[PDB]
Structure formats: C-alpha cells, structure tokens
Amino acid sequence: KLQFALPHETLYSEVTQVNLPAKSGRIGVLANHVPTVEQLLPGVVEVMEGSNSKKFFISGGFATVQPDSQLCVTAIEAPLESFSENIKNLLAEAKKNVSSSREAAEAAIQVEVLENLQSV
Amino acid sequence: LTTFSLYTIIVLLVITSLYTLTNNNNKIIGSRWLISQEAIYDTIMNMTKGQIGGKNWGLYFPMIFTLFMFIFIANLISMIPYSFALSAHLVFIISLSIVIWLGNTILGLYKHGWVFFSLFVPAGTPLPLVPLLVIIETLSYFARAISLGLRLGSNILAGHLLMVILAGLTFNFMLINLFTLVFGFVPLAMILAIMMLEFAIGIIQGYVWAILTASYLKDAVYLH
Amino acid sequence: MPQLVPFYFMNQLTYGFLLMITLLILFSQFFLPMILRLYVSRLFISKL
Amino acid sequence: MQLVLAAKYIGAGISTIGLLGAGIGIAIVFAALINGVSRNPSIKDTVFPMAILGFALSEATGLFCLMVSFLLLFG
Amino acid sequence: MQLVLAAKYIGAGISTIGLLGAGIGIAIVFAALINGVSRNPSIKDTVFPMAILGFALSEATGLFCLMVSFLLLFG
Amino acid sequence: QLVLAAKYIGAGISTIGLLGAGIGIAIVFAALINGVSRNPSIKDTVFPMAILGFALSEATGLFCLMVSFLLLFG
Amino acid sequence: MQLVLAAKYIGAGISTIGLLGAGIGIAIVFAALINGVSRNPSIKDTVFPMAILGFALSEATGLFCLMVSFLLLFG
Amino acid sequence: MQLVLAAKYIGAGISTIGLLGAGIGIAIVFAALINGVSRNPSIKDTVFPMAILGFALSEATGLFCLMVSFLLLFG
Amino acid sequence: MQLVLAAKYIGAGISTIGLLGAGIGIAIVFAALINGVSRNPSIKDTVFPMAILGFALSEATGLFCLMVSFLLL
Amino acid sequence: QLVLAAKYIGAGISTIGLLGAGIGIAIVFAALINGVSRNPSIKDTVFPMAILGFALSEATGLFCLMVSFLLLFG
Amino acid sequence: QLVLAAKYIGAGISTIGLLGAGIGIAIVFAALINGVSRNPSIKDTVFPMAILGFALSEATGLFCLMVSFLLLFG
Amino acid sequence: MQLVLAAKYIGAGISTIGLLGAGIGIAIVFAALINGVSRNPSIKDTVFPMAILGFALSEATGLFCLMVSFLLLFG
Amino acid sequence: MQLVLAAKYIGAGISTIGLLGAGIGIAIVFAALINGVSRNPSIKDTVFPMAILGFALSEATGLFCLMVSFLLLFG
Amino acid sequence: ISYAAYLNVAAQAIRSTELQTASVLNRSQTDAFYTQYKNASEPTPITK
Amino acid sequence: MLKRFPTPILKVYWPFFVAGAAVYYGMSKAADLSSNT
DSSP, X not given: OEEEEETTEESOOOOSEEEEEETXXXXXXXXXXXXXXXXXXXEEEEEEETTEEEEEEEOOXXXXXXXXXXXXXXXXXXXXXXXXXHHHHHHHHHHHHHHHOOHHHHHHHHHHHHHHHHHO | OOHHHHHHHHHHHHHHHTTTTSSSSSOSSOOTTTTHHHHHHXXXXXXXXXXXXXXXXSTTHHHHHHHHHHHHHTTTGGGSTTOOOSTTSHHHHHHHHHHHHHHHHHHHHHHSGXXXXXXXXXXXXXXXXXXXXXXXXXXXXXTHHHHHHHHHHHHHHHHHHHHHHHHHHHHHHTTSOHHHHTTOHHHHHHHHHHHHHHHHHHHHHHHHHHHHHHXXXXXXXXXX | OTTSOOSOHHHHHHHHHHHHHHHHXXXXXXXXXXXXXXXXXXXXXXXX | OHHXXXXXXXXXXXXXXXXXXXXXXXXXXXXXXXXXXXXXSSTHHHHXXXXXXXXXXXXXXXXXXXXXXXXXXXX | OHHHHHHHHHHXXXXXXXXXXXXXXXXXXXXXXXXXXXXXXXXXXXXHHHHHHHHHHHHHHXXXXXXXXXXXXXX | OHHHHHHHHHHHHHHTTHHXXXXXXXXXXXXXXXXXXXXXXXXXXXHHHHHHHHHHHHHHHHHHHHHHHHHHHO | OHHHHHHHHHHHHHHTHHHXXXXXXXXXXXXXXXXXXXXXXXXXXXXXXXXXXXXXXXXXXXXXXXXXXXXXHHO | OHHHHHHHHHHHHHXXXXXXXXXXXXXXXXXXXXXXXXXXXXGHHHHHHHHHHHHHHHHHHXXXXXHHHHHHHTO | OHHXXXXXXXXXXXXXXXXXXXXXXXXXXXXXXXXXXXXXXXTHHHHHHHHHHHHHHHHHHHHHHHHHHHHHO | OHHHHHHHHHHHHHHTTHHHHHHHHHHHHHHHHHHXXXXXXXXXXXXXXXXXXXXXXXXXXXXXXXXXXXXXXX | OHHHHHHHHHHHHHHHHHHHXXXXXXXXXXXXXXXXXXXXXXXXXXXXXXXXXXXXXXXXXXXXXHHHHHHHHO | OHHHHHHHXXXXXXXXXXXXXXXXXXXXXXXXXXXXXXXXXXXXXXXXXXXXXXXXXXXXXXXXXXXXXXXXXXX | OHHHHHHHHHHHHXXXXXXXXXXXXXXXXXXXXXXXXXXXXXXXXXXXXXHHHHHHHHHHHHHHHHHHHHHHHHO | XXXXXXXXXXXXXXXXXXXOOHHHHHHHOOOXXXXXXXXXXXOOEEEO | OOOOOOOXXXXXXXXXXXXXXXXXXXXXXXXXXXXXX
16 A cells, blocks of 8 residues: 655555655565665656556655555655756756855755756 | 688678668668668667767767677677688787777877876876886786787687587487487587577677777777 | 687788778768668658 | 696696686676565566676676686597 | 596596585575565565576586586596 | 595595585575564565575585595495 | 505595585574674564574584595595 | 696696686676666666676686686697 | 605695684674674673674684694694 | 796696686776766766776786786796 | 605695684674764774674684694694 | 796795785775765765775785795796 | 705795785775775774774784795795 | 755755646745744844 | 768778788788798
8 A cells, every 4th residue: 555645735645566766776665565764865756556657756755664564655746747848947047056155955956856857 | 712711701791781682772661670770870879979979979980880790790600500710710800909909009199199198197196106007007008908809709719619519529429329319408408508698698799899999999089 | 729720810811901991981981871861861751 | 648638637627616606606696686676676677688698798707617628628 | 547547536526616606606596585575575476587597597507517527527 | 546545535625515505505594584584574485485595505515515425435 | 555545634634625614604694693683673582493493504514524524534 | 748738738727717706706797787777777878888898897807817728728 | 654644734734724714704703793783782682692602603613624633633 | 847837837826816806806896886876976086986996906916917927938 | 854845835725724814803893893883882882892703703813823833843 | 956946936826826815905995985985975085095095005915925926936 | 855945935835825815804994994984974083093903903814824924935 | 954954945946847836836935034032032033 | 772972081090000001011920920830
C-alpha cells in the first residue's frame, strides 16, 4: 500500500511498483521491503499501479516503508507534464543570483531543480 | 600471389557490399540491412564526439570510422573456420598500432611543442619530483603503444588457438571407443560456448580499440 | 610459432597499408557521406 | 628430452593457477548484478546488458590463462 | 621414465590449487542473493534466475580448471 | 622412489585447494546472519537459499579433496 | 628411502597452507555475528544457533586439511 | 641444453599466474559500473566512457604479463 | 641423512604460511567488535563474550598450523 | 647452461608482480565510478586526482616489469 | 652443508607467515578510526579494546617470527 | 660459480614478488581519497596532503623490497 | 660453500616476500584516516595521532620480515 | 539553511510551467514578521 | 546507391601517413633481418 500526501494535495494517500529517488540513489518498493526511512531528494518519481505508470515530479521529502507494508511518501509539491521552459529562463536569473550572495545556496538548489527538470 | 594480399582483397570486397546492395538505392524509409549501418554510424558518431569532442571532433571521424570497420570486419573474417588470419598475423595489427601511436606522438610534439612533455606532468606536486612523474608517466605512455595492439592481437590469437586445440582433443575423443563417443558431445559444446564467446569479445574488442585510440588522440589533439 | 612467423613481413605490410589507405579514402569520400545523405534528407523532410 | 617433457607437464599445472582469478572475477560481476537489481527493482533493463558485457570481459582474461595452459599441456 | 610419471602427479596437484578461486566465487554470488532478497523480499522471483545464471558461469571457470587437473592426472 | 614421492607431494599441493572452500562456506554464512539481522523476517525465504548456497560452496571443496585423495591412494 | 621420507615431511608442511583459509573463514562468520547482534539488539536468540552452525561448517574444511596432513606425515 | 629448454617452459608456466590479478581487476571495474548505474540511472551516459577507459587500463597490466608469457613461449 | 633433515627444516618453513590466515582472522574479529560497539554504544556487554569466543576459535586454527611445524621439528 | 636457465626461471617469477598492479588500477577506476555516481558533479575535481592515482598505481607495476626485462634480456 | 642450506631456505619461507599479521594490525586500527569518527565518544571504551586486538593480531606474527629464529639456529 | 650466479638471478626473481603489495597499497589510499572527496566536496584541502603522505608511506615498504631485489641482482 | 652461499641469496629473496603485507597494511590505515576525516570533518585532532600509532606497528611487522632478509642477504 | 528550508527553496522553484493555477501562486506568497523578544525587551521585527 | 563527395581532410592526416612510411621502410629492414638467422 502507498500513501502519498502533500501539504496541498492527497495523491495515492495496494500500489504495484513505486520508484522513488532518495539520498541513497534510487529505491524501488514492491510488496514488503526493508522498513527503512530514507530522505527523498528533489526528484522525478514514478508510481505504477498494475502496468500503468504515472510520473510525478516531487520536491523531495521523506519516504518511509513502514513495517506493515505502507509506503508513506510526504513531499511539498508536484504531475510531471504540468511542471513543464520559463524555468529555463529562470535559471539564468538564478545564475546571476549565485554571484551576489544564502542566495548562493538557494540558487544552487535552483541549478539542481532545472537540471532535474531538463533531465526529464 | 601472397595469402595476406588475397585476404586483404576479401576484406575490401566485404566492406564494399555493405554500402552498395545492402541499401535500396538510398531509400529514405530505411531497409532492414541499412538500419545496421545506420546504428554503426550513430554509435561512432556519438562515441568520437564524446572522446575527441571539441572544435574539431569530426576531422578525425573518418579515420576512427575506418579503424572501427576494418577491425569489425577483420574479427569476423578471421573467425571463419577455414580462413587466413590477417589479424593473427599480429605484426600487421601491431604495426598499425605503432603507426597510430607514433602519429599521435609526432602530432602532439608538432602541435604542442617541446612542452608536449608537460602533458606528462599531470598534477602539481613538489618540484624535485615533477621530472620523476614525467619519467614514469612517459614510460606508461609508450606502454600504451604496445598495449593497444597486443590487446586485440591476444584476443584473436587466443580464440583460434583455444578452439583448434580443443577441437583436436575432441576429435580423438570421438575416435576412441564408442561408449566415450556417447557423452562426448559435451566437450564439443564447450568449443561451441567458446566460439559464441569469441565472436562477442571480438566485437567488444573492436569497440575498445576505437575508444582507446580516441583517448590517445584526445590527448594528442587537446593538450590535457 | 611458425604460423605467426613468416619472413614475408614487409610483403604483408605492403598489402596491409595499401588496404588501409584504400578503405580510408573509400569510407571518407564514398560511403560515409552516403549515410550523411540519408540523415540530411530525413531532416529536410522533417523541416518541410 | 624426458626432462623437457616433464617440465612441460609441470608447467601446464602452473598455468592452471591463473584460472582462479577469473573464477572470483565472474562472481564479482554477478554479485553486482544481484545487488543492483535489488536496489531498484527496475534498473534491470539497463543493468542486464552491462552484466553481459562484464561477464565477457572477465571471462576473456580467463581464456588467456587457458590458452597458455593448453600451449604447455598439449603443445 | 620416473621423471615423467612424477611430473604427471606433480602437475595434477598444482592444477588443483586453481579450483579454490572458483569456490570463493560461488560463495560471493550466493552472498549477494541472500542480502539482496533480504533488502526487498519480493525481488526473489526476478533475482533468482539471475542468481542461478551467475552460479553456473562462476562454476564453469572451476570446471575448466578441474578438466586440466584430470588431463594431467590421466595424461 | 621418485614416483611414490611424487604421490605424497602431489597430494600435499592439492590440500591448498581446500583453503578457498573454507572461506567460501563462511561468506555464505556471513550473508545468512547479515540477512536475518537485516530483515527480521526474511528468514523463512532465506533459509532454503542458504542451504543451497552452502551445498554448492562445499561442493567445490569436495572436488579439491577427492583429487587430493586420488593422488595419494592411487 | 631418504627421498620418500623427505617427501612425506614436505607434503605435511604443504598441507598446513589449507588451514589458513579455514581460519579466515571462522572469523568471517564471527564478524557477521557481531555485526548482526549490534544491529538489532534482539536478533541474537535466532542468530546465535545459525552462528554455531556456520562455525562448524567453516571449521570442517580445515579438519579435512588436518587429516590429509596426518596421512602424509605418518604415511 | 635440455635444462635451458626445460627452464624456458617452466618459466612460461610461472608467468601465467600473473593473469589472475588482471581478471579480478577487470571484474572490480565492472562491479563499480553496475553499482554506480543502479545508484543513479541518470549518471549512466557520463559514467559509461569512464568505465571502458578503466577497463582497458586495468586490462593492460594483464597484457604486460601475457607478453612475458609469449616472449618465453614463442621466443 | 642430509636430505631428510633438510626436508624437515624446509617443511617447517612452509608451515608458517598457515599462521598468516589466523593473523588476518583475528583482526577481522576485533575489527567487527570495534565496529559493533561503536554502532550500538551498548551492545558491548552481550557482544564481548561473543568476541572472545570468536577470537579463540580463530586463534585455534593458527595453533594447529604451529603444532604441525613443531612436529616436523 | 644453468645460468641461462636461471634467468628464464627468474623472469617467470618476476612476472607475477604485475598481478597486484592490475588489482590496484582497477580499484582506482572503481572508486572513480563510484564517486561520480555518488556526487553527480565531483568529477571535475576528482578526475585529475584519478589520473594521478592511476599513474602511481601503474608505476609500481612497471617496476615489476622492468625487473622482469632485466632478468630476461639481461 | 645441505642441512645448513635448508635452514636458510626455511627461514625465508618463515617470513611469509608474518605478512598476514601485518595486514591484520592495520585492519584493527582501521576499525578504531572508523568507530571513533562515527561516535566522537565511544573512544574511551574503544581505545582499550583496540589495544587488546592490536597485541593479539601482532602475536600471530610473533609465532611466525619465532619459527624463523628456530630454523635459523636449527 | 654457475650455481652462485644462478642463485643471484633466482633470488632476484623471488624478491620481485613483494613489490605487488605496494601497488595495491597505492590504490587503497587513492580510493579513499576519491571516496572522501566525493562525500564532502570540501574535505579535500585537509585530505589531499594526508593522502600524499599515505602514498609515500605505503610506497616505502615496496621500495625496501625493490632495494633487496637490486642487491640480489647486481650484488 | 657454493650451496650455502646460494642458499643465502635464495633465502633472502624468499624473505623479501613478507614486505608486501606491510605495504597493504599501511595503506589501510591511511585509507581509514581519510575515510574518518571525511566522515567527521573534525575528528582529526584525536584521530591523526591514532593513525600514526596504527601505521607504526603495521610497518614494524614489515621491518621484521626485512630484518630476516638482511640477515640472510648480508650474512 | 535548515532541512525544511532546503526543501522550501526547491518547492518555490517548482512553482515556476506558467500554466499553473492562482492557488499555487498564492501558496508561494507569504507575509510575516519575526519579532524577536528577550527577557520584555523587543529586538526589531523583520520580514521572513 | 553511391555518390562521391571528396573529404579534403586527408591533409590533416599527414603525420599518420608519415609514420606509415617510416614503419614501412623499417619493416623492410626487419623482414630482411628475419629472413636471416
């Protein structure tokens, strides 16, 4: 079972195969899995129910396989196609931001986010 | 004539046929056979743009393509079970390797002066062992000279020699008493497994040639 | 091994370097640009 | 000649030692395959060709030992 | 003569050393299987075919070694 | 004489082969323990896997052993 | 006479080499025991009989080496 | 003379042992490739050139070894 | 005479090789002990008996090699 | 005769030294591949360090090889 | 003089045994550094534990060394 | 004379074995350098001089071995 | 004697093999140092002295092997 | 930069494509003043 | 089927061809030396 809930939505809140991108690379959960807690990095996420696959762009969060086979995914915001050009313009602004100043870290996250979006 | 000359002609004739009757007079849609030579084009395009990428990357793209295709065909022709191995005349493959290696060394010296040997200072280190790190970098630099040739050479030589010696053993295994002839097919199957592996490792070695003498050419074309 | 040693090395090498120069010209001028025709044509149909 | 022939048969055995490394080698590649597939549940389409490449290359090093072994043993 | 007969028995022994490598290899593949299946308890149906493939290939290097041992033993 | 000497030497050499098998058995058992501690609950699935792995690891050792004996006795 | 007796002593010495692998093996099982028990605090009752089993099997390979050593020494 | 020829073929056998190292090495590079890819699917295109580069360089030591074997055998 | 006494000495030298395995073995046990204890902070009282047991068994293998050396001497 | 034999035997034994260098080289490249997959972006810093590491590991293997040639030819 | 030759040969072989202990010593100390870096705080318990292992690993090598001296003297 | 000269050459060859450990040694240090630097992105200024120290020290044992090899060979 | 002087040179060569273990050992300590420092960022003030201690005894095991080599070699 | 701050900036970036609803844009707007206090005494209020 | 487009970068491959000539000459001497004992 998968429970995917966000502070403004409830998505998948069983689910056949789920692929999640975590600070440990990528983790896939199918049935029982070891009941770890792993922090989700800014991500492209796929959730598959049967063979049907739905693709989510996930802002990072935390993932926890519960020892009862409940995949708790919580993250700040997301479908993938909806996120998708103007942001590519925005990264140019963000590059400028790296130059001036906390803003560096912010802009670094922005570089990660454009890169991740360009990746898909 | 010379056996070597006759098989070089056979290689030339194999290579011609792949671009003169494989295709349907250059049909845009693409023929099943012509799809093969498209994929070869793309994987060396995308490989040699990746290796010797830079302003010039396509200027040595024909050379890396005919170094692919020569070895790619010569590791199929040399594996026919009654054929004269051009490649297992190691001296031609090794001579070709030394030629490309010297033609990199000369190209590098010409393009990047006598400060070409600054390539063999790879990293900042205290100055009294900067020259040391040139000696035991250059030693390895012309170990690449013989590695590139001997890699391919060993692969081809080992395949034919392995198969023929085991073939000779299994011939005499089936030439003795028939109860050993029964349950004597399993060593033949071992030669079959080796032959399956030898075709695979020959195409893999041909790709490895062309990436490595792209890597040496990367060094020669772009100093560091 | 005598099957890997002829003394005909320079003979071999003559026919060998001839095949290399032949294939180099042959690919470069003939067979490589006829693949590039397929590509450029495909892209021209794509534009129109 | 008896000395040289005995030297061959001993030397053949010596060459056989080289195979041991390849045996461990095959395993190292397959261990990675199993581990990786366990990580993703899904990487396997990408990784399985990589495993085949890996098997062939490791095995090839093994064959070099085998051909030297047979050069002494038979040859 | 005595030298040749000795050489067969010596060379056989030397060959046997090689087999040790394959043994370690086999274990490594199984180790990956156990750990892998532990990490995702439903990976087993995919992974178990892969595991048997890895076993067989690792074992094969051992087989070639043991063949050379028997060739020296009886030749 | 020399031929009989060669039997005793040959046997000795073969005994070296056993070292690998010893390491092998252990590697499988290490994985069993690691696996059990890792899942808490894989144990019923993993136990038949472990037995299989033990047997195969051991088998390579057995081949080394029989060659050792074979050179000694005959 | 002298040669055969000499050979027996040498062969016994060679046989000890086999033991080295069993030593490393035992350690590997025990390391796993320590690591597992430290990971769970609670697996220990299940894991301890497994550990004893693994010890015995690993040890047993070394035992095989020992009996062969005695056989060569004594003849 | 026979001693020289004997020694040549013995020496050949001895050199072959070196190859085992390269076989394990080749496997180690491929193990890294499989693990890296599984840990990040998007890395794959960057990593694949580096993997082949590493394979060759690893292999090269084995080819040096093999060349000594061939120097003795053919020469 | 000479050959047999020589052979005994040679055989003894060879016997040391078995000990190397034990040396590594002991280290692996102790490394594990340190790792476990550093991971848990508190496993140590359960683990320390286990560690001593593992040490002894590893050492015992080396002892077997050593006594065979002594027998040849 | 015996001297000629000795240099050939010694050449064989010396070749074994290469074994370690092959493992060494692979460990450097392995760490490179692992590192780049871990960071996504370390590679610019790490790649010079990796080439340095390759050279030093390889150099040890070349020491083995030159000793082999000093025996064999010399 | 064959016996005297044999003493010297045996001695050389005896050094091989020491190699394992040398690696072993480092492995224990590696664990120490790892543990200490993980906790910052385990260190006061662990440093004694480490020293116990350090000595023990060394002792195996001492046995090998002792056999070398026993051979050398006879 | 012949035996003594022979013994120099044989002794040199045997000595060359030891060098291998130092080769592996350099790699173990460099592996840690790469791994550490990949973990932090920023440890590197401390870690790089530590690594060069580690290289030199690991190498030193190898160099002692190389000295003995030369002493046997030339001396 | 010829045999005795030969045995000194040969025996020395064998003695040199021991150095390999120390080389790998030293590298492991420095690897652990780099790993630890990269893990903590800041442990180093305590840990660097510890690393020198671990280095020292690992090195010492090598020096023992070396000293046996010197004894045989020099006489 | 706290862990949740790290995620926060990423989330803000994700609202950048332009097809997005007003409520999304409203969730990115904020208005607050962290007014520090001590002892009674009040160090000055300043926007988040 | 076929078409011809000259690729003029054969004069960029001048050190490669020069190396071929040198090795060609050297192999003449090598072949003569190998046809001798």
